[PDB]
């Protein structure tokens, strides 16, 4: 399992996602595409926009095809809108293959393209269920798999402060220890089940349904770890108490105010370690993943930091803060998500992120909410 073409094929600014090189059309038109496992449309900019600079030019592709059908994607704090079509796609530092796929050519934007982000489009890598306009618009990865011999599998190493996407394979060099897998509960988002939460080993002692209310997803297109209101409050209460030797304003905890120490003097060790126990492959087994303050304290330009754990009303989003500690294998073929300690993860001399198991956990499928 060696994939040296694909290693280090991701780049990205802090809090502005991780993107990848893709070409579309004939002749090839290069674009930087956000890697988003929380959506299922491959959409790209196809018109002028201030924060864009390059874009898809459909009238220059001899292989473009118009599906003569619009698509409208509203969401939490914005919208994008565009015209459906198809065209040959490739990934220069990906599998050596060209495939025809659904492309959404974006024409209206609103709080979507981010200034100085250097990505021009989005590659939704999750399931048809949540594709727009409807689940019959085949997402790119499916197309890729069905048109080639590429296994139904991708893995993501994301490094805090670049990273790798391996399509079709697990690269052992990107991580150490063992891979541990958790079931994909249902195939829309990469939904999975959390059965226990610990701050420095203290249980939140919470009815585990609260952890997945009304779902727990793995989303590379979300920066923060987002937790359900109820879980969030208890988590911050516990993190507060554990780092209480130094105190911060309410505003820091709400993800607003930065906090700064002199360069190189960051007291990582006063902040607690956060562990999520995920449902295992075998009955009555969980494994845990364990992330550091280095993961949930996001650097900003003294060394300055922004708290990267926020409230949610739509359930647990396991974002980049979580993904940055782990090689995360997206094993669609066997319906499961594999975690291993990332070889590229940020940590101090004294504490590392971790992936340990097994643990005896009874009644784990009570931990999902319906
Ligand atoms: N993963 C997400 N992708 C998006 C793409 C476009 C617009 C909004 C998006 N929101 C996402 N999140 C997953 C659940 C809520 C946030």
Swiss-Prot record:
Inhibited by RTN3 and RTN4. Its EC number is 3.4.23.46. This is Beta-secretase 1. The keyword Cell division does not apply. The gene is BACE1. Residues 1-370 are extracellular. The modification N6-acetyllysine is found at residues 69, 205, 209, 215, 229-230, 237. It is an enzyme of class 3 (hydrolase). Expressed at high levels in the brain and pancreas. In the brain, expression is highest in the substantia nigra, locus coruleus and medulla oblongata. The active site is at 36, 219. GO terms for biological process: amyloid fibril formation; amyloid precursor protein catabolic process; amyloid-beta formation; amyloid-beta metabolic process; cellular response to amyloid-beta; cellular response to copper ion; cellular response to manganese ion; detection of mechanical stimulus involved in sensory perception of pain. It is found in: Cell membrane; Golgi apparatus, trans-Golgi network; Endoplasmic reticulum; Endosome. One of its GO terms (molecular function) is enzyme binding. Responsible for the proteolytic processing of the amyloid precursor protein (APP). Cleaves at the N-terminus of the A-beta peptide sequence, between residues 671 and 672 of APP, leads to the generation and extracellular release of beta-cleaved soluble APP, and a corresponding cell-associated C-terminal fragment which is later released by gamma-secretase. Cleaves CHL1. Induction: Up-regulated by the Ca(2+)-regulated transcription factor NFATC4. Disulfide bonds join 159-344, 208-367, 260-304. GO terms for cellular component: axon; cell surface; dendrite; early endosome; endoplasmic reticulum lumen; endosome; endosome membrane; Golgi apparatus. It is a single-pass type I membrane protein. It comes from the Eukaryota. Residues 18-340 form the Peptidase A1 domain. DXXLL motif is required for a proper endocytosis and retrograde transport to the trans-Golgi network, as well as for regulation of lysosomal degradation. The transmembrane domain is necessary for its activity. It determines its late Golgi localization and access to its substrate, APP. It catalyses: Broad endopeptidase specificity. Cleaves Glu-Val-Asn-Leu-|-Asp-Ala-Glu-Phe in the Swedish variant of Alzheimer's amyloid precursor protein. The lineage of its organism: Eukaryota, Metazoa, Chordata, Craniata, Vertebrata. Belongs to the peptidase A1 family. Monomer. Interacts with RTN1; RTN2; RTN3 and RTN4; the interaction leads to inhibition of amyloid precursor protein processing. Interacts with SNX6. Interacts with PCSK9. Interacts with NAT8 and NAT8B. Interacts with BIN1. Interacts (via extracellular domain) with ADAM10 (via extracellular domain). Interacts with SORL1; this interaction may affect binding with APP and hence reduce APP cleavage. Interacts with NRDC AND NRG1.
């Amino acid at each position: 399992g060696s994939f040296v073409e694909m290693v280090d094929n991701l780049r990205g600014k802090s809090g502005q996602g991780y993107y990848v090189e893709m070409t579309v059309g004939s002749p090839p038109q290069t674009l930087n595409i956000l890697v988003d496992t929380g959506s299922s449309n491959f959409a790209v900019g196809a018109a002028p926009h201030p924060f864009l600079h390059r874009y898809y030019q459909r009238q220059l592709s001899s292989t473009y095809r118009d599906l003569r059908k619009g698509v409208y994607v509203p969401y939490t704090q914005g919208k994008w809108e565009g015209e459906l079509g198809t065209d040959l796609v490739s990934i220069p530092h990906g599998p050596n293959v060209t495939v025809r796929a659904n492309i959404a050519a974006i024409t209206e934007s609103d709080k979507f393209f981010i200034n100085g982000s250097n990505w021009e489009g989005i590659l939704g890598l999750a399931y048809a269920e949540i594709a727009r306009p409807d689940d019959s618009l085949e997402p790119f990865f499916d197309s890729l798999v069905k048109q080639t011999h590429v296994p139904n599998l991708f893995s993501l190493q994301l490094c805090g402060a670049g990273g790798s996407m391996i399509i079709g394979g697990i690269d052992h060099s990107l991580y150490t220890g063992s891979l541990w897998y958790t079931p994909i509960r249902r195939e829309w988002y990469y939904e999975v089940i959390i059965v226990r939460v610990e701050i420095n080993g203290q249980d939140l002692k919470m009815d585990c349904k609260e952890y997945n209310y009304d779902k727990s997803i793995v989303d590379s297109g979300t920066t923060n770890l987002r937790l359900p209101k109820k879980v969030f409050e208890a988590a911050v209460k516990s993190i507060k108490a554990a780092s209480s030797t130094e105190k911060f304003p309410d505003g820091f905890w709400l993800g607003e105010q930065l906090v700064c120490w002199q360069a190189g003097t960051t007291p990582w060790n006063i902040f607690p370690v956060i562990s999520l126990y995920l449902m295992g492959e075998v009955t009555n087994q969980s494994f845990r993943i364990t992330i550091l303050p280095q993961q949930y304290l996001r650097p900003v330009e003294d060394d300055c930091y922004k708290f990267a754990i926020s409230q949610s009303s739509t359930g647990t989003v396991m974002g980049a803060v979580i993904m940055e500690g782990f090689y995360v294998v997206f094993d669609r073929a066997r319906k499961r998500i594999g975690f291993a300690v990332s070889a590229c993860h940020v940590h101090d001399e004294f504490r590392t992120a971790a992936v340990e198991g097994p643990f005896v956990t009874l009644d784990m499928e009570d931990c999902g909410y319906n």
